[PDB]
Ligand binder design. Structure first.
Ligand code: NA
Length: 366
C-alpha cells in the first residue's frame, strides 16, 4: 500500500517525524525527486497556504528549505519539501552525527544567513528553534548545510516581549547559538523552566568559560542576542560580522589593521582613549611576565605593536622564538589567545568608533 496524490507519492510506513498540531512528515517523492511529504489536517489548511507562499518568496536561498509543490485531496493538503538528514535537535542530542565532521560555527553562520534572507524579504520566522532548523542531505561534493524550515511560537525559545519585529528571531537564534556551542544547554535552563525564566530574565551562560578566548568571543555575541531589551539585540547582518565567525587568519589581520590605524594617534585622541579604557586587566597587569620564556628575551596599544612587529619581521627572526610563536597565521594568533582571552573582545568593542571606515568595513556593519 502506497499513497499517490499526483504529482506527490509517499509511503505510509516511512515517517520522518511528527508535528505538535497533528501534521505528519513522510518520506515520499515528487516528479521523480526524493522529497519529504508534509501531511496537514483541515484545521491547518489556512496555515499551510501562507507557509508555502512565504517559501515561494524565500526558498531560493541555500539556507531556506526548497519547496516543491502542494497537492490537496478531499481529506488533506500535502506539502512536497526538500528531504533532509536530521533536525538540529537530533544533530546536537545524538553525537553519531559527530562523524559527519560538521563545524558548529559554520552551521550557525548558515542558520543566520537564511534568517538574514527572510528579514531582507520582510519575513519574521517567529518560531526559530533546533526542531525547525534542518541538516541537509550530503550533496555531490559531500557538503552538508543548515537550513531553515516551518514558519505564535513554541515554549522556551520565545522572546520575552512576545508574551512582530525581526529582533524576536535574534533572541531565538541567541538561544540556538548557545544550544549548539554548549552542546545541549539553553541560556534559560531546562525545557519546562525556560519560558518562566525568560519572563523573569534569569539566564546563565556558565558553559562558556570566562578566561577562554573562544568562550569569551561567543559570550560577547550571545549576551547581546538574548538581551531583554529588543533594541539592544543586533540584526542578522550585524551577527554575521561578529568575530565569532572570523577565521584565525582574519582575527590576526584585525589586530594588524587596528595597530596600523593607531601610530600616529595621540593618547588624548578619541580612538586611543576608548582602546586603553579598562585594560589594564585585559593585558593581565603586565604582558611581559605571562609571555613564553624565549619571547621575553627578544598598555594594549603597545601589545598590539609587539604582535604587528613580530608578524612583519617573522622570517627575519630567530628559529627558537618562531618555534614557540608560529606557524603563522593560525598558530601565531593562537599564541596570544588565550594568553589574553579578552584581547579581541575588548579591541572589537573599543574600535567600534571606526566601523564606517573602508579599512574596517570587513569587521563591522554600518
Ligand atoms: Na533553498
Amino acid at each position: 500500500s502506497v499513497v499517490i496524490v499526483g504529482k506527490i507519492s509517499f509511503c505510509p510506513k516511512d515517517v520522518l517525524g511528527h508535528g505538535a498540531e497533528g501534521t505528519i512528515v513522510y518520506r515520499g517523492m515528487f516528479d521523480n525527486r526524493d522529497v519529504a511529504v508534509k501531511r496537514i489536517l483541515p484545521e491547518c489548511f489556512s496555515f499551510a497556504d501562507r507557509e508555502v507562499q512565504l517559501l515561494r518568496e524565500s526558498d531560493e536561498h541555500p539556507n531556506v528549505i526548497r519547496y516543491f509543490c502542494t497537492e490537496k485531496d478531499r481529506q488533506f493538503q500535502y506539502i512536497a519539501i526538500e528531504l533532509c538528514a536530521a533536525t538540529l535537535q537530533e544533530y546536537v542530542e545524538q553525537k553519531d552525527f559527530a562523524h559527519l565532521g560538521l563545524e558548529p560555527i559554520t552551521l550557525l553562520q548558515q542558520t543566520t544567513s537564511g534568517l538574514a534572507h527572510l528579514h531582507s524579504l520582510n519575513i519574521v520566522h517567529r518560531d526559530l528553534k533546533p526542531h525547525n532548523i534542518l541538516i541537509s542531505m550530503p550533496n555531490a561534493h559531500g557538503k552538508i548545510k543548515a537550513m531553515i524550515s516551518d514558519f505564535p511560537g513554541t515554549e522556551g525559545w520565545i522572546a520575552p516581549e512576545m508574551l512582530p519585529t525581526y529582533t524576536v528571531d535574534i533572541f531565538s537564534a541567541g538561544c540556538v547559538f548557545y544550544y549548539v556551542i554548549s552542546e545541549g544547554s539553553h541560556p534559560f535552563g531546562k525545557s519546562l523552566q525556560r519560558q518562566a525564566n525568560i519572563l523573569l530574565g534569569a539566564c546563565s551562560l556558565d558553559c562558556l568559560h570566562p578566561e577562554k578566548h573562544e568562550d569569551v568571543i561567543a559570550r560577547e555575541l550571545i549576551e547581546k542576542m538574548i538581551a531583554m531589551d529588543p533594541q539592544k539585540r543586533p540584526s542578522a547582518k550585524h551577527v554575521l560580522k561578529h568575530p565569532f565567525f572570523w577565521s584565525l587568519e582574519k582575527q590576526l589581520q584585525f589586530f594588524q589593521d587596528v595597530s596600523d590605524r593607531i601610530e600616529k594617534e595621540s593618547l588624548d585622541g578619541p580612538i586611543v582613549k576608548q582602546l586603553e579604557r579598562g585594560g589594564r586587566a585585559v593585558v593581565k597587569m603586565d604582558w611581559r611576565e605571562n609571555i613564553t620564556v624565549p619571547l621575553q628575551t627578544d598598555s594594549v596599544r603597545d601589545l598590539l605593536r609587539a604582535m604587528r612587529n613580530k608578524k612583519h619581521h617573522y622570517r627575519e627572526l630567530p628559529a627558537e622564538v618562531r618555534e614557540t610563536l608560529g606557524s603563522l597565521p593560525d598558530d601565531f594568533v593562537c599564541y596570544f589567545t588565550s594568553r589574553f582571552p579578552h584581547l579581541l573582545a575588548h579591541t572589537y568593542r573599543a574600535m567600534e568608533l571606526c566601523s564606517h571606515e573602508r579599512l574596517f568595513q570587513p569587521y563591522y556593519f554600518h
